[PDB]
Tab-separated table of all heavy atoms in Angstrom:
chain	number	residue	atom	x	y	z
G	100	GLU	N	222.512	-89.221	17.902
G	100	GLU	CA	222.408	-90.654	17.954
G	100	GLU	C	223.049	-91.189	19.248
G	100	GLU	O	222.602	-92.256	19.744
G	100	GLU	CB	222.867	-91.349	16.680
G	100	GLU	CG	224.089	-90.849	16.004
G	100	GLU	CD	224.174	-91.310	14.572
G	100	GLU	OE1	223.491	-90.685	13.755
G	100	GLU	OE2	224.907	-92.310	14.321
G	101	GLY	N	224.060	-90.533	19.794
G	101	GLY	CA	224.637	-90.866	21.078
G	101	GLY	C	223.469	-90.912	22.112
G	101	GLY	O	223.215	-91.981	22.711
G	102	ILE	N	222.785	-89.773	22.271
G	102	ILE	CA	221.601	-89.659	23.190
G	102	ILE	C	220.609	-90.791	23.101
G	102	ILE	O	220.284	-91.415	24.080
G	102	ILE	CB	220.824	-88.314	22.985
G	102	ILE	CG1	221.614	-87.107	23.481
G	102	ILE	CG2	219.429	-88.385	23.613
G	102	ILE	CD1	220.973	-85.802	23.057
G	103	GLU	N	220.117	-91.061	21.849
G	103	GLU	CA	219.102	-92.071	21.668
G	103	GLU	C	219.604	-93.524	21.927
G	103	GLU	O	218.792	-94.330	22.491
G	103	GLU	CB	218.462	-91.948	20.261
G	103	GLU	CG	218.843	-93.096	19.348
G	103	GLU	CD	217.715	-93.496	18.452
G	103	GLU	OE1	216.803	-92.635	18.242
G	103	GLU	OE2	217.673	-94.688	18.032
G	104	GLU	N	220.826	-93.849	21.544
G	104	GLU	CA	221.292	-95.228	21.712
G	104	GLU	C	221.750	-95.466	23.216
G	104	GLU	O	221.632	-96.554	23.680
G	104	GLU	CB	222.426	-95.569	20.748
G	104	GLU	CG	223.366	-96.668	21.283
G	104	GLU	CD	223.884	-97.569	20.203
G	104	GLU	OE1	223.050	-98.107	19.387
G	104	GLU	OE2	225.107	-97.863	20.173
G	105	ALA	N	222.176	-94.452	23.868
G	105	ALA	CA	222.537	-94.584	25.281
G	105	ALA	C	221.264	-94.569	26.201
G	105	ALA	O	221.265	-95.000	27.334
G	105	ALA	CB	223.547	-93.489	25.676
G	106	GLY	N	220.163	-93.975	25.633
G	106	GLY	CA	218.901	-93.887	26.337
G	106	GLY	C	218.956	-92.854	27.447
G	106	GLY	O	218.335	-93.029	28.504
G	107	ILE	N	219.710	-91.809	27.190
G	107	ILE	CA	219.785	-90.654	28.054
G	107	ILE	C	219.051	-89.379	27.533
G	107	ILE	O	218.303	-89.459	26.570
G	107	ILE	CB	221.232	-90.328	28.403
G	107	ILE	CG1	222.080	-90.167	27.102
G	107	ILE	CG2	221.835	-91.415	29.265
G	107	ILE	CD1	223.380	-89.499	27.280
G	108	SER	N	219.200	-88.254	28.161
G	108	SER	CA	218.704	-86.998	27.661
G	108	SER	C	219.764	-86.063	27.269
G	108	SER	O	220.896	-86.111	27.791
G	108	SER	CB	217.819	-86.328	28.718
G	108	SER	OG	216.554	-87.024	28.813
G	109	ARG	N	219.469	-85.083	26.407
G	109	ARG	CA	220.411	-84.022	26.119
G	109	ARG	C	220.931	-83.429	27.438
G	109	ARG	O	222.135	-83.110	27.537
G	109	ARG	CB	219.827	-82.965	25.192
G	109	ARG	CG	220.837	-81.875	24.787
G	109	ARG	CD	220.843	-80.819	25.879
G	109	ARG	NE	221.792	-79.720	25.711
G	109	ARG	CZ	223.008	-79.638	26.275
G	109	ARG	NH1	223.460	-80.571	27.096
G	109	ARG	NH2	223.736	-78.550	26.011
G	110	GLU	N	220.133	-83.392	28.455
G	110	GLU	CA	220.485	-82.709	29.716
G	110	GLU	C	221.519	-83.454	30.563
G	110	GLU	O	222.230	-82.791	31.347
G	110	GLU	CB	219.208	-82.361	30.524
G	110	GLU	CG	217.922	-83.128	30.038
G	110	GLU	CD	217.183	-82.509	28.888
G	110	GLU	OE1	217.371	-81.279	28.642
G	110	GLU	OE2	216.428	-83.228	28.166
G	111	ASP	N	221.671	-84.734	30.335
G	111	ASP	CA	222.719	-85.536	31.022
G	111	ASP	C	224.097	-85.187	30.456
G	111	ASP	O	225.077	-85.593	31.055
G	111	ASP	CB	222.481	-87.040	30.906
G	111	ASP	CG	221.100	-87.395	31.409
G	111	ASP	OD1	220.710	-86.875	32.467
G	111	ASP	OD2	220.393	-88.207	30.747
G	112	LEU	N	224.153	-84.519	29.333
G	112	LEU	CA	225.426	-84.245	28.664
G	112	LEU	C	225.834	-82.808	28.935
G	112	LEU	O	225.032	-81.905	29.130
G	112	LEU	CB	225.314	-84.405	27.144
G	112	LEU	CG	224.982	-85.720	26.466
G	112	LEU	CD1	224.764	-85.533	24.998
G	112	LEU	CD2	226.034	-86.796	26.739
G	113	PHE	N	227.153	-82.669	28.843
G	113	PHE	CA	227.814	-81.419	29.008
G	113	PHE	C	228.532	-81.061	27.683
G	113	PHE	O	229.515	-81.716	27.301
G	113	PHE	CB	228.839	-81.484	30.142
G	113	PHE	CG	229.286	-80.119	30.667
G	113	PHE	CD1	228.655	-79.568	31.779
G	113	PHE	CD2	230.255	-79.437	30.030
G	113	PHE	CE1	229.030	-78.291	32.290
G	113	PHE	CE2	230.662	-78.174	30.534
G	113	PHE	CZ	230.040	-77.604	31.645
Side-chain angles (χ1 to χ4, degrees):
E100 45 197 79
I102 288 172
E103 110 142 26
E104 155 147 311
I107 54 164
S108 286
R109 184 277 177 260
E110 16 278 337
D111 305 319
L112 299 172
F113 199 96

